[PDB]
Amino acid sequence: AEEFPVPNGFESAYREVDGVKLHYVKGGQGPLVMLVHGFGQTWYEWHQLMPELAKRFTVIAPDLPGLGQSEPPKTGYSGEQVAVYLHKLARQFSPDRPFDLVAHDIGIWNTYPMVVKNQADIARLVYMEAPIPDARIYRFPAFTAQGESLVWHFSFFAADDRLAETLIAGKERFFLEHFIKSHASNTEVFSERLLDLYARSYAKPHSLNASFEYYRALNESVRQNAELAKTRLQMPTMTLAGGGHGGMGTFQLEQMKAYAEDVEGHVLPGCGHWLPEECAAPMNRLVIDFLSR
Amino acid sequence: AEEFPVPNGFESAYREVDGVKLHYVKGGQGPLVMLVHGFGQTWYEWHQLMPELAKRFTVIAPDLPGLGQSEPPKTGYSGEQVAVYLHKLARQFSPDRPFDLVAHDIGIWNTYPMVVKNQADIARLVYMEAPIPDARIYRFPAFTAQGESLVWHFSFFAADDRLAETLIAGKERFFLEHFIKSHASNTEVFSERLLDLYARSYAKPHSLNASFEYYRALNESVRQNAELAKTRLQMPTMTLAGGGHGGMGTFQLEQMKAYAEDVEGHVLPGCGHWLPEECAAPMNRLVIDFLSR
Ligand SMILES: O=C(O)Cc1cc(I)c(Oc2ccc(O)c(I)c2)c(I)c1
Ligand SMILES: O=C(O)Cc1cc(I)c(Oc2ccc(O)c(I)c2)c(I)c1
């Protein structure tokens, strides 16, 4: 059974990595590009970009441990632990060449440590719509003059007592729709069918828990990154962020400047947090052009 | 019927104020002191302080509109709107003399406007454990290096689509235990028996909704207070705050200095948000002594 429809010419498959069965969708020919999704989603958020990229690259889009059809991590959910799985998965398919990495949302948290620790393995890097976990996140406000902030979920999801699983269970579809649309500019792209598919996936009890364990490990990830960041990133990097409601605006590039020697950034007007779906055509174009250099 | 046990020698009664039936518990003789509870609780948080105060004062402890056994407000939930009900209630019992006010948590939000607008009616004032709604609240962090922040619930409760009622309905008892204990230093005072009492009250559907409407009106209260605060409070004031986990610490007094000419503050070590229950002996002593001047 597949949680999401696989594009033509792609295959849904699994690899064991350090005793954890990871799911991915793979297609194309050429140098490897790995696309890593974030919270509330799965490999499927990349399904529009994948066929275009597959004209020039071998494309792999894994499900993060515990999410989609991937088994939970056996080590832990901190960025350094999760990044091992993703790095080793990429290396199974690109053992002899560096590969490209594109990540969205918590896909950034789960890849940054393997990028900085294995720079020779990373040809080009694209990061969109999430802070790298560091002390900057402690400044985001709990509440705004316009009401509900965009970041209060960091605390909701990190809270103990399984607070988030307990309140969201039985209301997974309701909560996800609220979360996705409140972080969107272009809500129309989230059809009832698309929301149904994402909700069914993250509502699997181990996946609902996995979702929040990423946040329960966030402080540990920040502490980890405090040490890792002593080494600057040297590979060509591009950042993307939405400039509309729900988006991160200038933060993405400005943070990345502290991490990378060679970075260019774009802010996409009229687009929120969910760039691959809200603004597929220009996002796809920018990613394809940057990687095709 | 009574949701909470009335102390010996007190009465539970109701008063209709501008078309809204307010519940209160009253006892004692002498000048009037009104005690106003906050979120998650009812008049009952004051039940240990009340008999002591009643030796020197007429004591009234109302349920906030919509909470406990009080009807929802008919105007709205902004501070200025709710303060009218509380001011009129007090003045029914003390029409020719000023009265004392003690308020905790959102009790502050719901009384500040009537204090500033009717300064001659307030002899002495005690505020504990909440910010007065102003722009300072936009600076509190969504997430901290220790985990769950103090005020992330501001956004949860303010969120559209009845997000909070939808998630919390049926899980009120679970949620309230988490909320109260996460904001406490001395968690041991929150027995299952006591939590049962509070949860059964706020689980009434109109009470669960009323609770969150106070937060949905928070930005309105901030706008209201920006005008009101152009006049400083002139009456003797005391602030209390917990110095332990969950407490507001030095913020309480520091903010109050901007609002009051005559203020003394105390931070109680090893106590969190729930001062009357976590640290009954020193809190009661501070309040009784201050009002007895
Ligand atoms: O602190 C700054 O410089 C500016 C800043 C402020 C915030 I609130 C913020 O959080 C967001 C915003 C959008 C979003 O979709 C998500 I998920 C989190 C970020 I990233 C940066
Ligand atoms: O950042 C600052 O200025 C200091 C600050 C930080 C926070 I997070 C905060 O919110 C609280 C604190 C305790 C509490 O019990 C509740 I409910 C809310 C406050 I008030 C002040």
Q: Is residue B3 part of a domain?
A: no
- The structure tokens listed for B235 are 């009456």
Which residues are paired to A266 by β-bridges? Answer: A240
Provide residues of A within 8 Å CB-CB of chain B: 135, 137-149, 151-152, 154-156, 158-161, 163, 166-168, 171, 174-175, 178, 182, 218-219, 222
Query: Of B3, B79, B24, B67, nearest to B211 (Cα)?
Result: B67
- Whole-angstrom CA distances from A135 to A194, A219, B74 are 34, 9, 45
Domain that holds residue A133: 9-292
- The whole-angstrom separation of Cα A193 and Cα B25 is 53
Query: Of A218, A261, A267, A288, nearest to A52 (Cα)?
Result: A288
Q: Which member of B145, B160, B174 has the closest CB to residue A138? A: B145
- The whole-angstrom separation of Cα B200 and Cα B177 is 12
> What is the identity of the amino acid at A247?
G
Q: Is residue A4 part of a domain?
A: no
The residue with tokens 């969190």 is B272
Task: Region of B9 please: left (phi>0), alpha (psi -120 to 50) or beta.
Answer: left
Q: Is residue A257 part of a domain?
A: yes
Cα dihedral B67/B72/B77/B80 (nearest 10): -100
Task: Quickly count: other Cβ atoms within 10 Å of residue B191's Cβ.
Answer: 9
Structural domain count of chain A:
1
Phi–psi pair at B107, nearest 5 degrees: -55, -30
Q: Is residue B2 part of a domain?
A: no
Distance (angstroms) between ligand 2 centre and the Cα of B254 equals: 12
Q: Is residue A98 part of a domain?
A: yes
Contact call for residues B245 and B186 (beta carbons, < 8 A): no
Contact call for residues A106 and A38 (beta carbons, < 8 A): yes
Alpha-helical (H) ranges within chain B are 50-53, 79-93, 106-109, 112-117, 153-158, 163-168, 172-182, 192-202, 205-216, 218-228, 251-256, 275-278, 280-291
Query: Of A137, A133, A107, nearest to A223 (Cα)?
Result: A133
Q: Is residue A190 part of a domain?
A: yes
Beta pairing class for A147-148 and B11-17: unpaired
| Ligand 1 pocket: which of A140, A154, A256, A278 to mutate (most atoms within 8 A of CB) | A140
Contact call for residues A34 and A99 (beta carbons, < 8 A): yes
What count of Cα atoms within 13 Å lies in the side-chain half-sphere of residue A202? Answer: 31
Q: Which helix (H) or strand (E) holds A28?
A: strand A20-28
Q: What is the DSSP string of A116-185?
A: HH-GGGEEEEEEESS--SSGGGGGSBSEETTEE-SSTHHHHHH-STTHHHHHHTT-HHHHHHHHHHHT-S
What CATH number is attached to the domain comprising B91? 3.40.50.1820
Does ligand 1 lie within 6 Å of residue A138's CB atom?
Answer: no
Does ligand 1 lie within 6 Å of residue A183's CB atom?
Answer: yes
- The whole-angstrom separation of Cα A273 and Cα A141 is 18
- The whole-angstrom separation of Cα B193 and Cα B180 is 14
- The whole-angstrom separation of Cα B276 and Cα B99 is 21
Candidates B138, B148, B155, B212, partner chain A, best to mutate (most A CBs within 10 A): B155
Q: Is residue A194 part of a domain?
A: yes
- The whole-angstrom separation of Cα B100 and Cα A287 is 65
Query: Of A57, A65, A55, nearest to A24 (Cα)?
Result: A65
Q: Is residue B4 part of a domain?
A: no
- The whole-angstrom separation of Cα B86 and Cα B169 is 28
Q: How buried is residue A81: exposed, middle or buried, by Cβ count under 10 Å (0-12/13-18/19+)? A: buried
- Whole-angstrom CA distances from B123 to A29, A249, B63, B110, B198 are 81, 50, 22, 18, 31
Nearest residue on chain B to A157, alpha-carbon basis? B148
